[PDB]
Amino acid sequence: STEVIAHHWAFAIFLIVAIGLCCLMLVGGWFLGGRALRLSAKFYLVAMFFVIFDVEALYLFAWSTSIRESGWVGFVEAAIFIFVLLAGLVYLVRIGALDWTP
Amino acid sequence: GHPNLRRIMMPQTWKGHPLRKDYPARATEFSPFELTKAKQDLEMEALTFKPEEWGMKRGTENEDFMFLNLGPNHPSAHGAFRIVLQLDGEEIVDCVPDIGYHHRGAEKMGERQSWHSYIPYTDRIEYLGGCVNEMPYVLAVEKLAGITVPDRVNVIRVMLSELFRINSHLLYISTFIQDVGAMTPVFFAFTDRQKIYDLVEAITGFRMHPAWFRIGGVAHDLPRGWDRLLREFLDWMPKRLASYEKAALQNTILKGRSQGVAAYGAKEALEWGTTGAGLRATGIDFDVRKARPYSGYENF
Amino acid sequence: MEFAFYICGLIAILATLRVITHTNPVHALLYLIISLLAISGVFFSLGAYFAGALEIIVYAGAIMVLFVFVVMMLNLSEIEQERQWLKPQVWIGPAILSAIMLVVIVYAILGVNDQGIDGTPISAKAVGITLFGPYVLAVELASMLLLAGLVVAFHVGREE
Amino acid sequence: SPELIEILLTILKAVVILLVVVTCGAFMSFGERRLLGLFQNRYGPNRVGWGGSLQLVADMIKMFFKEDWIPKFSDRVIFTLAPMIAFTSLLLAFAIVPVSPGWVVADLNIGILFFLMMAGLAVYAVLFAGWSSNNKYSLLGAMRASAQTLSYEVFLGLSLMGVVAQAGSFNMTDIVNSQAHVWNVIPQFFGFITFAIAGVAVCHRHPFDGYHIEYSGMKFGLFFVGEYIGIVTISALMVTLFFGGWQGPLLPPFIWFALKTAFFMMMFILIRASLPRPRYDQVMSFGWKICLPLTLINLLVTAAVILWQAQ
Amino acid sequence: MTITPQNLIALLPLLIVGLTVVVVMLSIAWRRNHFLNATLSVIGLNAALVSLWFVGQAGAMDVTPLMRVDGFAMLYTGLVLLASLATCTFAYPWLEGYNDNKDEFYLLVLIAALGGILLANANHLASLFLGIELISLPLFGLVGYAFRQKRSLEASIKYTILSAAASSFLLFGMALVYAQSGDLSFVALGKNLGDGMLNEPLLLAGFGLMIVGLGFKLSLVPFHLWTPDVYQGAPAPVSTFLATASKIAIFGVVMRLFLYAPVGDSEAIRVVLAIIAFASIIFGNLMALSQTNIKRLLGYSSISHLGYLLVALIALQTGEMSMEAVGVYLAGYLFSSLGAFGVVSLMSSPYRGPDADSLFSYRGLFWHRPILAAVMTVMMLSLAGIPMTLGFIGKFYVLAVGVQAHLWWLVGAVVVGSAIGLYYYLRVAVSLYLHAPEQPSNWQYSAGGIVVLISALLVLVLGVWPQPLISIVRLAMPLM
Amino acid sequence: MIPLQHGLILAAILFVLGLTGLVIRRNLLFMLIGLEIMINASALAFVVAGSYWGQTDGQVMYILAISLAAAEASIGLALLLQLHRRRQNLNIDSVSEMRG
Ligand SMILES: CCCCCCCCCCCCCCCCCC(=O)OC[C@H](COP(=O)(O)OCCN)OC(=O)CCCCCCCCCCCCCCCCC
Ligand SMILES: CCCCCCCCCCCCCCCCCC(=O)OC[C@H](COP(=O)(O)OCCN)OC(=O)CCCCCCCCCCCCCCCCC
Ligand SMILES: CCCCCCCCCCCCCCCCCC(=O)OC[C@H](COP(=O)(O)OCCN)OC(=O)CCCCCCCCCCCCCCCCC
Ligand SMILES: CCCCCCCCCCCCCCCCCCCC
């Protein structure tokens, strides 16, 4: 169809012109003007929590777009999924893993 | 028997002792070579810091005690000062304050000015205080001269000291609220400070350091119509103060940031010599205006 | 459709060979992110929209962020000053066996029937429908696998 | 040929949307100054031009002709790379928003998924700015800020999943067409507040705000204009996802979209001017213990209500 | 397909173990108690073991496009659950001396047992992948549970990296097989190939990559080099679990894969597996000669016994008694490894810190611990194929299976490897009774001693009378 | 229009390049990077195979693959952090004490 290829062209021009304008104003900023510790493991902990819960989030992303055709059995499976996810979250909170201060 | 007897007002490489009578008071010759030398000292101090001469122990012995420098540049009204923090994650294991970055030699200047011309130097001891800073010096000189000021002098000096106290408290509350994170109360409190400054400009002729108290009285008389400005200020204040409380001082985010942080009892306040609101927050009712009254504060 | 597929595949291969030979960890992770973007473009060229969505959202958006967090946590010595993976006496053996494996797999691939990928978009709705249909226990025990990884990584990665 | 005419018209509409949103972000920064002045009982910048409208051009000229300074012992590529990430990620996050019927850049079948990819890629700006500055203070600050935005990004898509479930599709045209009778703010109010909090936090806005003390000239301008582009992006997203999008009874649809977007930007200004800043660990506790279970329970209740009506 | 409540009865041990994981996790989150969490974990494992009876009463059925449940699956589910229960029983006295958190161990054991159950009931490449990963990742946590110790962290890093590589190999092989076939079901691999077109190059290369992954998972040569280091460095209950449950479940899903798929009729894969089994037997017996550390010796023993199991596997398409022999050998090997590693775990407990040596020094064990030495020498005789032991009956079954399909090279390999095993097993058994100058007090240590005692008596009784085991293995029959 | 053989060739190439990255690098971080390259390449292979047949099975196995990749990243980076904490280096032949 003409509409889909036209919008693909429009999206391509959008990306190209955005990148070109941004790097162009970088070029204008550079071109003008005259010249003259050890971290803690808590950052890794919260980042790995974020990664695991983003994979849980991707599963819920796949579920949420097709609730109507999956029916009530999909609701039951996602309820078990979400209950396991919340049990893991309560486990992380209760043992002081998610508490930033010691 | 002192644990770490090092210099606190002058840098460690400073020959002589300034408050001795055989030491010259005026400024010595300036040299950019010494400026470059002290710049080099600052540059290798940030890279080759040795947490031993400051009295600290455990110089990153736990392999995670990171070292931070807060100052010396400080984007706030307190002024320039340094704290060297030893940190375990976010916990402050130990800190050594480094002061002396605002030493003007006011006592040595006290040995160099007369009793009359030293009053402006008494103003700039605490620049949020002004006449409150002028008051104890002129009272002590009146004790030395055997002067008993009349009642009108006492009421005038109480008026100006209370006005500058309101000014300082407004600045303090606004700066604390800005340190928590709210922005509008500093603008509003500085508008109120401008009202105070209008009245103080009418009375003395200056905003921050009036230099208006004298040995035995004040410089001039009250101008014809000061009561109108005082009435305008007293009508302007309390609604705005209640608005400040409601807008920022009752916010639960500010309460979570401020309640229970750096708490100490009465024993810690007494053993460290903390006075003022820090002593009266411990329940020790010790105000100088009520315990050892001065300048007609009994009449109020 | 094919044009984007070929360019994105070339970009992914180039970024991978830049990853495996580089010395700076942050530059290596950046080139790996570029490779994941290229592989997402490969997914979008073939019609697998949800696969590309999870390629940038999760692999490029969570896992690489975790690697980046670990790299900046370590303040990454003993690697850059010798660079022994570029002298041929170390890498020529694995490269030769690597090429042998590649020719074997390519020879196996080239002898199969091929009707060509039509590029018909299998959207996220069909993936979600089949994911909670014939793939129930896969979802549940994958959640338990992520739970196990969470518990293991928490237990190992403390400081005491 | 009419096909080429339609292609050129669509390209013209897309580039018009692009320049309009970039100019809107820059003038929204100017409106930040003016509206902060209005909220704080003053005027703000109102001397450079008629009403101050030419302050923006003078500021951009100053940042253009400022001497650029890449640090000597830094990593040049990463240091310059963080600002194009901070700009382009939120710009292409705006790229999916349909501002009017027919005035849409791309009717992507993923949509809010594509916003999730761009929001995931946005954290590399903060991480790269912290590492490439060769400053341990900026490194620690960016580690804290990146942990903040990860802990608040972890529930962004889960907050949006209620709108996705009610629409039944990932396309934004279907989302703004499913709000014909009732807007999504009424059923998805908890999703609305969680998405608003997450969108404020991933834009590093007050009260979720150093790793910018090493940038100057046009790189700082890139960071700040990209941040305001993200503000406009999040406002337009919440207009299209919770407040009916372009749909309105009386006025033309673009006027409704602009009015709702401007309302949400002035809500951004008021949120910055009003609330103070919570502590780091309190923000962590609020982002983990409260918001994520709230989004999960909201998704479960949304699915139960959706399956309940379709007996 | 959809899921019926009868299918949920067929899902009983999986759901019970998952709910036990949830309950143990919430009990850990409530308050950290070692005894309560261990009791909850063993109660849930026993509940799954006794719910296997209800699963068998329900019947055999295909619960999912993924899963199929039959008596074959119940047999391996019971073996995995018994191995997990023994691992918890041996792990409690080891965990009394652990200064850090003792409670995550039972959660990881439970999740690994869950993966073993999924691999037992697997009838799909997705279920195979997920069961392998659900076995491997808790073992990544368990091998380096004492991460402050040097050897445990060593073995954890080695096992994690190598098993991630094997996971990538297996998943690429499944990708190639799915690309060739078109369906991921076990029975639909090469179904469209007919009349001599079974040997398809893409399918064969994909299955070869799966062979690489599963041969890492089964310690088969040349993917065997990880076995002694990971076995030695890991804690002794972890070595027990990794020797028994992981090997049993992965070999069971390999049995189901090579039985159901028409790919197993290919002679090329049969020749490749014959070479792998021959080299595995010969190597795993030969490198255990000069071993003085018992853990590395048991690792090479595991390599040799999985070679014997592969020899029993090869005659699946030709013979008919291959799976029955595999089940008998797996039961006997499970009991023998459980007893040997249990004796090692009991005499290497409590965990006396990471800075102290964990060397065993089994010489002179009889002169202060007579019952443990008796159990250990009984099970060293059991692993050698010496009669009046169940390992002898298993080796007899393997030899009969090899003779039936005329796999004579494998038979000679079994004989030679059995002789080498006789040498080193008998050296250890005699060294238990020599003289050494250098040489508990709770009911859990007594429980572990009771467990290894019943294991030794079971081995002896089923060695002098193997008919009930043969009958209950023939009762467990999958769906041809 | 796009052949299936081209997709599997690209996936195989990325997989074997990840194998080089795993083998030739002593740094454990680059070993984990090569592991992630291989598992992501095999996930690409599954997506190509599923897109040829027009089924979502490739995308489902892709989802399982990236779940494994995320959890393996978590475990491997935790082990790397422990190794750097207790040895102050990331040399993989430094952890070679058990042998024979
Ligand atoms: C495009 C449009 C978007 C524009 C923006 C609109 C949405 C803005 C959302 C802003 C979100 C800010 C979130 C701040 C969370 C702070 C949580 C926290 O922990 O705060 C600390 C404080 C005290 O914590 P506690 O542990 O109790 O302290 C005891 C120790 N002293 O804890 C507390 O004080 C507890 C209460 C915390 C805050 C509750 C939620 C407030 C949300 C902001 C107000 C929204 C108002 C409506 C906005 C317009 C809607 C159309
Ligand atoms: C180190 C010790 C162990 C040594 C290695 C293990 C034993 C190796 C045995 C090699 C046997 C080679 C057989 C070669 C021909 C095979 C194909 C064939 O035609 O077989 C014939 C026959 C099967 O055909 P069928 O239809 O049954 O014919 C009727 C036979 N009555 O076949 C049959 O019916 C069965 C044939 C069985 C042959 C005897 C096998 C055992 C012999 C005793 C042990 C080996 C010799 C002694 C040890 C060697 C020195 C150490
Ligand atoms: C007539 C021909 C046809 C009939 C053939 C019949 C074959 C079966 C019967 C014969 C078996 C021969 C076995 C020879 C070795 C006997 C065991 C032995 O001597 O053990 C002692 C020896 C250690 O003693 P020492 O010399 O002190 O070594 C110092 C090391 N610490 O220990 C060692 O050195 C290590 C022992 C390792 C295990 C034993 C060796 C196994 C070798 C393969 C066995 C099968 C042979 C098959 C037929 C081959 C050809 C005859
Ligand atoms: C084959 C099944 C097991 C049979 C019994 C094996 C031995 C078990 C332990 C029983 C007691 C053994 C006593 C040995 C005494 C040796 C004394 C030597 C004196 C020089």
Tab-separated table of C-alpha atoms in Angstrom, chain B residues 45 49 51 54 56 66-71 82-87 92 94-98:
chain	number	residue	atom	x	y	z
B	45	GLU	CA	47.051	17.653	48.370
B	49	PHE	CA	46.349	13.169	50.555
B	51	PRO	CA	44.972	11.020	56.394
B	54	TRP	CA	44.724	15.456	60.495
B	56	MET	CA	42.380	10.471	61.443
B	66	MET	CA	36.614	6.545	50.028
B	67	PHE	CA	37.775	10.114	50.610
B	68	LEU	CA	35.739	13.180	49.668
B	69	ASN	CA	36.311	16.927	49.921
B	70	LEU	CA	33.237	19.098	50.411
B	71	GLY	CA	34.781	22.536	49.959
B	82	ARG	CA	36.441	22.359	53.951
B	83	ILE	CA	35.344	19.000	55.329
B	84	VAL	CA	37.346	15.881	54.470
B	85	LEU	CA	34.946	12.939	54.686
B	86	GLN	CA	35.934	9.304	55.101
B	87	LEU	CA	33.085	7.215	53.716
B	92	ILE	CA	30.410	8.929	57.304
B	94	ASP	CA	35.012	10.115	60.291
B	95	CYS	CA	35.324	13.724	59.158
B	96	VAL	CA	37.909	16.431	59.827
B	97	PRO	CA	36.708	20.031	59.365
B	98	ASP	CA	39.301	22.385	57.893
